[PDB]
C-alpha cells in the first residue's frame, strides 16, 4: 500500500507540474526581472 501511494504521489506531482503553467513562477520572476533590468539599461541610452 505504501509503495502504491508513493508511486501515485509521484505521478500526480508530474501531472501537476505538466498541467499548470504557474508552478515555476519563482524562477520565471527572476528571469523576467533580470531581462527587464537589462532592457531598461539599454533603453536608457536613447535619452538626451
Amino acid at each position: 500500500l505504501i509503495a502504491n501511494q508513493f508511486n501515485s504521489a509521484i505521478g500526480k506531482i508530474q501531472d501537476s507540474l505538466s498541467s499548470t503553467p504557474s508552478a515555476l513562477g519563482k524562477l520565471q520572476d527572476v528571469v523576467n526581472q533580470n531581462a527587464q533590468a537589462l532592457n531598461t539599461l539599454v533603453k536608457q541610452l536613447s535619452s538626451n
Binding site: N39, V42, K43, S46
Partner: protein, 49 residues
C-alpha cells in the same frame, strides 16, 4: 563593403559595425530597422535597395 568592421553613414544614420546580407523583408517605404530595445540592427541601402 561587407563582412568587415567598418563605419557607415546611411542617409544620416551613422554607426560602426559589420554589414551582412539579411533575409528580412522591409515594406517599400522603411529605411532602417530597430530591435526591441530601440537599437539599430538593419539598414536599407539607398542605392541598391
Amino acid at each position: 563593403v561587407k563582412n568587415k568592421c567598418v563605419n557607415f553613414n546611411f542617409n544620416g544614420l551613422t554607426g560602426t559595425g559589420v554589414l551582412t546580407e539579411s533575409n528580412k523583408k522591409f515594406l517599400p517605404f522603411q529605411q532602417f530597422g530597430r530591435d526591441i530595445a530601440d537599437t539599430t540592427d538593419a539598414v536599407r541601402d539607398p542605392q541598391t535597395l
